[PDB]
Amino acid sequence: EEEAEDYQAETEIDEEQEEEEEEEEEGEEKIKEKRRHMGDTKHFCPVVLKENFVLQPGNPDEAVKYREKIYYFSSTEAKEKFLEHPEDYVSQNEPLK
Amino acid sequence: NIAQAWKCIRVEALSVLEEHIAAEKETGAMLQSLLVSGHSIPDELVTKLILEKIKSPEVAHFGYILTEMPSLAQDNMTSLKQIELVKNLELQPDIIINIKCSDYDLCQRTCGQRQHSTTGYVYTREQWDPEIIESRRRKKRDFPKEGKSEEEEEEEEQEEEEAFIAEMQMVAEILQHLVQRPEDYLENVEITVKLYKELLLSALEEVMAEHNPQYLIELDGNKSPEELFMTVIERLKYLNVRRAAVITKLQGTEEEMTDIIDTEELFRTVSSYKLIAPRYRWYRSKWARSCPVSLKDGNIYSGAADYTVSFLGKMYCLSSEETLKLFSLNPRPFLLPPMPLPPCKVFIFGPEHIGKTTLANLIAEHFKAKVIDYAKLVQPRFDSAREKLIKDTITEATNTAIKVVQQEVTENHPEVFAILEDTLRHAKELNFEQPHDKQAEILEEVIKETEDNKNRFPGAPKHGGWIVENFPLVRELWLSLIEKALLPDLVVYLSDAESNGK
Amino acid sequence: EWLPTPITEAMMKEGLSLLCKIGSGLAHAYIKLEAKDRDLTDISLLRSYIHLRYVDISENHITDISPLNSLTHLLWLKADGNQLRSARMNELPYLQIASFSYNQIIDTEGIFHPRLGSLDLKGNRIHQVTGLDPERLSSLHTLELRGNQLESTKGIYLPKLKNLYLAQNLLKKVEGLENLSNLTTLHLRDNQIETLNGFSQEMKSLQYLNLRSNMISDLAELAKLRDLPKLRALVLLDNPCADETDYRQEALVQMAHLERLDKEFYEDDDRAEAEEIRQRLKEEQDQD
Amino acid sequence: SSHLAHKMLSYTYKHMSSFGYWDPVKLSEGETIKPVENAENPLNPVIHRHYIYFLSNKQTKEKFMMNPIKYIRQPKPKATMPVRIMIVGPPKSGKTT
Numbered sequence A: 001e002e003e004a005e006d007y008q009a010e011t012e013i014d015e016e017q018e019e020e021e022e023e024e025e026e027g028e029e030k031i032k033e034k035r036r037h038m039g040d041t042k043h044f045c046p047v048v049l050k051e052n053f054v055l056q057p058g059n060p061d062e063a064v065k066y067r068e069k070i071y072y073f074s075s076t077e078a079k080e081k082f083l084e085h086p087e088d089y090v091s092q093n094e095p096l097k
Numbered sequence B: 001n002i003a004q005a006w007k008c009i010r011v012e013a014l015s016v017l018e019e020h021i022a023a024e025k026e027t028g029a030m031l032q033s034l035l036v037s038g039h040s041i042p043d044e045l046v047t048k049l050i051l052e053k054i055k056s057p058e059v060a061h062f063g064y065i066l067t068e069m070p071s072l073a074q075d076n077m078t079s080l081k082q083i084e085l086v087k088n089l090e091l092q093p094d095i096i097i098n099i100k101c102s103d104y105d106l107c108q109r110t111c112g113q114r115q116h117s118t119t120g121y122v123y124t125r126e127q128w129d130p131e132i133i134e135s136r137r138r139k140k141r142d143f144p145k146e147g148k149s150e151e152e153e154e155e156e157e158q159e160e161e162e163a164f165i166a167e168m169q170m171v172a173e174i175l176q177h178l179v180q181r182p183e184d185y186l187e188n189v190e191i192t193v194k195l196y197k198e199l200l201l202s203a204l205e206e207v208m209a210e211h212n213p214q215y216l217i218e219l220d221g222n223k224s225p226e227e228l229f230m231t232v233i234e235r236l237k238y239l240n241v242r243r244a245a246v247i248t249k250l251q252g253t254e255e256e257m258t259d260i261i262d263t264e265e266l267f268r269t270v271s272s273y274k275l276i277a278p279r280y281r282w283y284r285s286k287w288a289r290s291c292p293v294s295l296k297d298g299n300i301y302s303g304a305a306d307y308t309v310s311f312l313g314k315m316y317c318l319s320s321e322e323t324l325k326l327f328s329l330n331p332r333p334f335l336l337p338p339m340p341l342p343p344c345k346v347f348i349f350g351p352e353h354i355g356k357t358t359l360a361n362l363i364a365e366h367f368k369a370k371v372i373d374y375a376k377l378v379q380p381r382f383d384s385a386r387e388k389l390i391k392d393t394i395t396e397a398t399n400t401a402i403k404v405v406q407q408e409v410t411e412n413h414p415e416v417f418a419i420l421e422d423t424l425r426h427a428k429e430l431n432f433e434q435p436h437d438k439q440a441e442i443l444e445e446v447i448k449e450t451e452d453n454k455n456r457f458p459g460a461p462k463h464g465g466w467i468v469e470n471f472p473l474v475r476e477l478w479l480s481l482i483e484k485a486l487l488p489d490l491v492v493y494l495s496d497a498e499s500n501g502k
Numbered sequence C: 001e002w003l004p005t006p007i008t009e010a011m012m013k014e015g016l017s018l019l020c021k022i023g024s025g026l027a028h029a030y031i032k033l034e035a036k037d038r039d040l041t042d043i044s045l046l047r048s049y050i051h052l053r054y055v056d057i058s059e060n061h062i063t064d065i066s067p068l069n070s071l072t073h074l075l076w077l078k079a080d081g082n083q084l085r086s087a088r089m090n091e092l093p094y095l096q097i098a099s100f101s102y103n104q105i106i107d108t109e110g111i112f113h114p115r116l117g118s119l120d121l122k123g124n125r126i127h128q129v130t131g132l133d134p135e136r137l138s139s140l141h142t143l144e145l146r147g148n149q150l151e152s153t154k155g156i157y158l159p160k161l162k163n164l165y166l167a168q169n170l171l172k173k174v175e176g177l178e179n180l181s182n183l184t185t186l187h188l189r190d191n192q193i194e195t196l197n198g199f200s201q202e203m204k205s206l207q208y209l210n211l212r213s214n215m216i217s218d219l220a221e222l223a224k225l226r227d228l229p230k231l232r233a234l235v236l237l238d239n240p241c242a243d244e245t246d247y248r249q250e251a252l253v254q255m256a257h258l259e260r261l262d263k264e265f266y267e268d269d270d271r272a273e274a275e276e277i278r279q280r281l282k283e284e285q286d287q288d
Numbered sequence D: 001s002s003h004l005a006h007k008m009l010s011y012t013y014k015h016m017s018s019f020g021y022w023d024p025v026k027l028s029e030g031e032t033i034k035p036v037e038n039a040e041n042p043l044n045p046v047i048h049r050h051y052i053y054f055l056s057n058k059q060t061k062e063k064f065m066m067n068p069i070k071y072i073r074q075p076k077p078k079a080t081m082p083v084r085i086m087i088v089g090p091p092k093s094g095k096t097t
Helices: A002-017 A020-024 A028-035 A046-052 A076-084 B002-006 B013-022 B026-036 B043-054 B057-062 B079-088 B103-111 B130-142 B150-175 B186-210 B225-239 B263-272 B292-297 B321-329 B356-367 B374-406 B414-429 B435-456 B475-483 C009-015 C044-048 C066-070 C246-254 C268-287 D002-010 D024-029 D058-066 D068-072
Strands: A059-066 A069-073 B096-100 B113-116 B122-124 B216-220 B304-311 B314-318 B345-349 B370-373 B466-469 B490-493 C019-021 C028-030 C032-034 C054-056 C076-078 C097-099 C118-120 C142-144 C163-165 C185-187 C208-210 C233-235 D044-048 D051-055
Touching: A002 A020, A002 A028, A046 A076, A059 A076, A069 A076, B002 B225, B013 B026, B013 B043, B013 C019, B026 C009, B057 B321, B079 B186, B096 B186, B103 B113, B103 B186, B130 B150, B216 B225, B263 B304, B263 B314, B292 B314, B292 B321, B304 B321, B314 B321, B345 B356, B356 B370, B356 B466, B370 B374, B370 B435, B374 B414, B374 B435, B374 B466, B435 B466, B435 B475, C009 C032, C044 C066, C246 C268, D002 D044, D002 D051, D024 D051, D024 D058, D024 D068, D044 D058, D051 D058, D058 D068
Parallel strands: B096 B216, B345 B466, B345 B490, B370 B466, C032 C054, C054 C076, C076 C097, C097 C118, C118 C142, C142 C163, C163 C185, C185 C208, C208 C233
Antiparallel strands: A059 A069, B113 B122, B304 B314, C019 C028, D044 D051
């Protein structure tokens, strides 16, 4: 609902400010998703990178939030594991590798 | 004007006086007594108080801009003393500024001075002289208003004529208020300027030569202040130094509310409140509802949303209005190393010591907390207190029985001994009039030791890192722990499916 | 006479109003005292506060001002109504303005204070000038004296005067004023003046004059007043020939340089009428 | 927005990066001229991480959005002199031009 309120206000701002939003306009959900602000992995699951060193898009209908930013996971199992110790995975000291 | 631009903290002598008045200060009471005695406030006293303010922790966090010193000290104090004190400061100005002007033109600006009496408000000839106002009206009329039509020129002329005439009437009243101070008569001004020029200009030339010139700002006094104000902003950009962060109060706009909500709902509501823009909701601080000042002392508390604030973009609740003020004074120490981190105040329950003692030991080691053994420490003190009760009741009953039965009769007497021995049986049946009170008191006594001990530890928090094993389970006793609120942070209980065998 | 009411420290604490920094360094001082009508008989406690700059003590019962001479830095005072039959004083360097209206003061004597730009003494028991000197009152540019007992205007030795105000008085004629070229403004409504015999046009600044409610019945005074400086605005109603309002017409005929009387700035056809009457009068005088 | 930039700055909702008012892309390319506010030449601001970034032009903005880390790894700028020049020549037209 916070997402919806933010995006509604953004609709009003788009209609005020700029025509380029008219060229973007195709797809309400696509816009909403694209605007969301996301974990260091953005698209990807962190856990599978940390364990495997492998890159993979976490499921976009996963929904965890942490330090303002939103996270997907490669599997519900990954979400469950992640939820037990999210802080371990974070890029604490240097960029993702 | 400059401080009002930066919105940093600053030294301002009047602001010192007004703060000392408003805070009901005892030094403020000295000021009041001096004023009420019809006696001056010493320049040296002002200097002292200014120095104290600069040493103040809120100033030390914020930083400052200064001007008030140096001043015309040399008639008594060396002006060098102010410069010396400035150099002594831990805080010597990274950014230095000056205005230059012609001596005559400075005087002319001084001539353009009058004060409104009953407000005390000090005003410029642009206000105070109607003929300067009307000369500016002449200028405004002479410029043909490029970008507008004659209809707009006539509308704005007639409206400004009404404004000007009403302003003339008002200033006429202000003429009943206008004065030129003794210092503002040109002779006094010139004397003052000459004296400053010699003593302060000579000293300040050295004060300047010391500094980084590229840091140092020069400015033209012959100017609109807005010019200089923006110039200072631009210089600050070149300098690439920010304002210090400022605590932002997050009470509802005019509102007082039930913030006694779900923590999560309250967090969301606060983060939405006062917001600037979509998406950029305030960040949580790490401690959620908790009052970081209380925890820095070592008391777990969670704060009102009315006493909740954001700073550095992060959100922080506090337990009280006075805690809000205190933290507004200076966040830094309580956040800074060892960083806001818990004490221990804990019990654990279960059978025996079966590593349980060891577990407490290892916890205390990790914490640098220290453990209470209720059996070793508490129980003999409690027992000796009950001994004291029993010896007291013995001596009281023996005294009363001796006195009354003598009213010679002695402790050997059989009715005396019957009365004594039955009343002391009843004293054994009764107890200390509420024994758990003493047990809590003793807990406090040992706590006071542990508090000191943790203050001696490098992170030096007020509160003791304390643990009890061997507390004896009674429900109403536990209630008394609530009534005095001598509560732990945490309790653990121990359980098994089958270690009741293994 | 009144109950003893000397000054009180608590009332000072109430009255002292604004703080300001004075002298060399940052030393600091109270400049204003609010003390209007606490009945006061006495003020002696003020003797310490001499750095003070502003007082109101009007309508107290104060019979004396001797401390004020010690109260050096006072720049302005209100003391109206108070019980002073004169205000004779040392020549105070500091006082810029004060008022002592409706006081018992009978006279203009005894006051000298150079910085004093303005004074007011309306309602006072005063009849004629009693000493003036602008080489003492270096600043005194305005005075008001409404509702006094004033006879006539001798000895107003003060070319410094911007303005003066004398309505509601006993005034019978001008004297002395005739020299005050800088004087712009004199108010004398509700007085006893019988005649206005061309009173000296060397008072050349006298942009405004008020003489309503007086005793002038000779319209030919207007002709005698033809030779006058830039008085723009006149008031002269309620006079025993203002009874007939060609008073204004005759006046503008006599004084083209005048621009307002009473309630009428001269409208374009009023000007044209008076102008053509003046033309005729001039041409006939040339034929005379 | 400019307003949003100033508010985040004053409210400290983000850190100023060490670059300050310097375009990191031009700096890393090697350039030493400070860019200047105009209606033709506004700031291009962007947010990333806990940090604020400021850029001259849509092309430099684009490059930085393609990869900020590349510029961030560059060594920090440091304060400078201004410039003072004199130029002298034949009558106005060339030298003035």
